[PDB]
Write an enzyme that holds these catalytic residues in place. Structure first.
Site, PDB file in Angstrom:
ATOM      1  N   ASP C  29      66.863  48.373  38.962  1.00  0.00           N
ATOM      2  CA  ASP C  29      68.034  47.724  38.401  1.00  0.00           C
ATOM      3  C   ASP C  29      68.742  48.668  37.411  1.00  0.00           C
ATOM      4  OD1 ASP C  29      68.659  45.312  35.881  1.00  0.00           O
ATOM      5  OD2 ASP C  29      69.796  45.473  37.758  1.00  0.00           O
ATOM      6  N   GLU C  55      68.367  50.876  43.887  1.00  0.00           N
ATOM      7  CA  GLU C  55      69.381  50.386  42.962  1.00  0.00           C
ATOM      8  C   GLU C  55      69.350  51.226  41.681  1.00  0.00           C
ATOM      9  OE1 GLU C  55      70.828  46.099  41.017  1.00  0.00           O
ATOM     10  OE2 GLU C  55      69.622  46.127  42.855  1.00  0.00           O
ATOM     11  N   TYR C 130      67.460  50.208  50.389  1.00  0.00           N
ATOM     12  CA  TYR C 130      68.046  49.204  49.521  1.00  0.00           C
ATOM     13  C   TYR C 130      69.007  48.480  50.448  1.00  0.00           C
ATOM     14  CZ  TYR C 130      70.636  46.729  45.968  1.00  0.00           C
ATOM     15  OH  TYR C 130      71.191  45.740  45.203  1.00  0.00           O
ATOM     16  N   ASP C 169      63.684  47.318  48.605  1.00  0.00           N
ATOM     17  CA  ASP C 169      64.225  45.983  48.410  1.00  0.00           C
ATOM     18  C   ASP C 169      64.969  45.679  49.706  1.00  0.00           C
ATOM     19  OD1 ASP C 169      66.518  44.542  45.915  1.00  0.00           O
ATOM     20  OD2 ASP C 169      65.572  43.692  47.704  1.00  0.00           O
ATOM     21  N   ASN C 171      66.052  42.812  50.486  1.00  0.00           N
ATOM     22  CA  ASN C 171      66.889  41.657  50.186  1.00  0.00           C
ATOM     23  C   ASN C 171      66.737  40.432  51.070  1.00  0.00           C
ATOM     24  OD1 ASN C 171      68.573  41.501  47.829  1.00  0.00           O
ATOM     25  ND2 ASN C 171      69.510  43.434  48.503  1.00  0.00           N
ATOM     26  N   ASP C 241      60.720  42.698  47.930  1.00  0.00           N
ATOM     27  CA  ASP C 241      60.260  44.065  48.131  1.00  0.00           C
ATOM     28  C   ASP C 241      59.030  44.126  49.017  1.00  0.00           C
ATOM     29  OD1 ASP C 241      62.021  45.703  45.950  1.00  0.00           O
ATOM     30  OD2 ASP C 241      61.505  43.705  45.189  1.00  0.00           O
ATOM     31  N   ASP C 266      64.353  43.478  36.896  1.00  0.00           N
ATOM     32  CA  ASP C 266      64.169  42.082  37.281  1.00  0.00           C
ATOM     33  C   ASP C 266      63.264  42.066  38.524  1.00  0.00           C
ATOM     34  OD1 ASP C 266      66.065  43.305  38.829  1.00  0.00           O
ATOM     35  OD2 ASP C 266      67.574  41.707  38.665  1.00  0.00           O
TER      36      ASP C 266
END
Ligand SMILES: [Pb+2]
Ligand SMILES: [Pb+2]
Ligand SMILES: [Pb+2]
Lengths: 280, 276, 276
Positions: C29, C55, C130, C169, C171, C241, C266
């Protein structure tokens, strides 16, 4: 507080042989630790600056079929030989790029149990043999030291055989720092691949078989001269390394020996290239 | 979960002759344990002319009476690891006494362990072998490459003066068709490039993989299944056991079986039908 | 509040091999904020062989010297967005130089954001990604659908050549067990039927969700918690993840960890133990 780093500056090139002739042959050896990456890191640019008559590479780790066109298409060396160029054994591979075509080129050392990994290329010329090699690393936890001991015996036999026919130049990553002066931390590495008593003895025996460590012969007292530095912990910037790359010559070639240099300035691998100057 | 049923036996050879020689080979995973698991019962049912056992892991002294006293095989030969340990080991039980029997391959460094038995019959040499496993982390791989070279030379030697049948756990899945998961076992003992090439070199020396010769497109046919991951019940195995024949014996080849139904080890037995 | 404790580390694979590869993935993040929050401290405790970050939101020219100078990772690779934008950005720090490193998935449509790095090693490809977030009001769900298709094709391309490990990640909370509030999020980015189906399609293309594979009934195991409403304190999170492996690599799988006690983003890091 801290201990100061002792750097090494390679002496100027001696362009006159032991017997007084002018250097007319230039051989470079370089463990590129992954040829694809070495090439992307512009290793070929340095090679063109050195412009050796013969370029030997170790740890190419690239099947001949995967070789980038940048190198297979080099005009400078119309005669290129690739060994162990097997994709399935991406932990080996050697190469020899010659400006002049040798009489005959062979792979391995005539022992199938050793020739399954691309570690040795032997080029035969009218006056001598040129052998480049990527010696088997004793590896982690010395789990391969036994095999390495057998290799040293066999490889030495092979070299003495060739030496009986014609003089030879052996070059490459011999994965051994012969003496304590050949590595920064001899105390902490005596049980590590490359500096075990067994490997050191093997090299001592090779030399006593009638061969000479070119660099050590010209600079017997020069310490801190290394050809390898672990990528880890900024070792190279501190010159904390090992001398694993050599140019070993049979007695009969010493009269023609001009210089044996360590280009510790050339980047692109964890090994730097070494260049031999001969009068042939 | 792709399964495999071994085809029915073919008792007729290439040149028409009727099978007249039945040979069984089996890595017993410890002869003492194998016997307790009723291994001998299956043998009596298969009733082979010659039984070749690998990985017996038992010195003659300790051999169980149940096997040494088998009246079905008057002539038994045991090859143990010189050091009087019980490591590795192979055996050959015969109904007929061979013309001559020898141990090892004439190489002290290799004959240190009991891995080979050569029985010379009038028509052929029967060589049973338990090839060195490259083992965990391929620690014995280099030793294996040396073994492959010497063993090959030895076999070529015999083949020069007489046809030979080679059988046993050769510890290698020749091609991708020889194991369920080739991609993930590239760095596993039994499927390294060095081991594969070694086998190819043996075949290129004038020998034939009996089973693949008869069923070149047959997949999922294995002789080994790791005891782990319930591999056998799912038929997730390897083909490590073979019957490799000299060219001259091809005409007499009838069939090469894989008795995946026989239990008692992580390897199943393989049987060869020949017309000699 | 139902919390989750990650089990101790398992260092041996299903087939019996001891772990020889440790990989950590972490969506930081914003690399800059993360470093300041001492993320590197934790990184040094974990001391993985390879560190993948997602990220990063930071142009290479702006990377804090604290990370670009880590002596532990000599080979660092950065994949940022075209004009040094703060969108996405991934990185891979290795102790050993890979054979070849490539950026993107071969489509300028998706390579304008620095979302993927592929490291080719002798026995496998390491891909860190990502995945594009379906974002607010699913305004970017269509693009995400396109992405899933191409990315799947890309991974299949590599897989046909060498086995691979995909981390990052992705998502998406694959199934209901992968998030605290399934019902309330069926129409929110990360849990739409479309994103779920996309992930399912990828696994059916020959890949395995490492963590779910080892702990099929383990609920409340998340890798992400919104910074808002003290979500992390209540363990109201999502498992976004993953370490997705070519199924062929399963026997070499040792453990897939969720380091939920490590702070700084986060997301928490995830670590993979493998036998390659
Ligand atoms: Pb290396
Ligand atoms: Pb066993
Ligand atoms: Pb942040």
């Amino acid at each position: 507080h801290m201990e100061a780093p002792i750097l090494y500056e390679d002496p100027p090139e001696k362009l006159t042989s032991k017997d007084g002739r002018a250097a007319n042959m230039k051989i470079t050896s370089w463990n590129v630790d992954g040829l694809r990456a070495w090439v992307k890191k512009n290793g070929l640019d340095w090679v063109r600056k050195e412009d050796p008559d013969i370029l030997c590479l170790q740890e190419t780790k690239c099947a001949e079929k995967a070789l980038p066109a940048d190198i297979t298409a080099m005009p400078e060396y119309p005669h290129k030989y690739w060994a162990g160029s097997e994709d399935k054994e991406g932990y080996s591979g050697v190469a020899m790029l010659c400006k002049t075509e040798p009489l005959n080129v062979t792979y391995g050392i005539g022992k199938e149990e050793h020739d399954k990994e691309g570690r040795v290329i032997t080029a035969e010329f009218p006056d001598f043999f040129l052998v480049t090699a990527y010696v088997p690393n004793a590896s982690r936890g010395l789990v391969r030291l036994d095999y390495r001991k057998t290799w040293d015996v066999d490889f030495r036999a092979y070299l003495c055989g060739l030496d009986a026919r014609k003089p030879l130049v052996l070059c490459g990553d011999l994965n051994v720092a012969h003496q304590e002066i050949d590595l920064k931390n001899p105390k902490g590495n005596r049980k590590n691949a490359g500096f075990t008593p067994e490997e050191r003895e093997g090299f001592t025996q090779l030399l006593e078989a009638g061969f000479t460590d070119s660099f050590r012969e010209l600079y017997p007292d020069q310490a801190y001269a290394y050809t390898f530095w672990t990528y880890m912990m900024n070792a190279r910037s501190k010159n904390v390394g090992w001398r694993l790359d050599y140019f070993v010559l049979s007695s009969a070639l010493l009269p023609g020996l001009c210089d044996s240099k360590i280009r510790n300035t050339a980047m692109g691998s964890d090994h730097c290239p070494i260049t031999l100057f001969l009068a042939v």
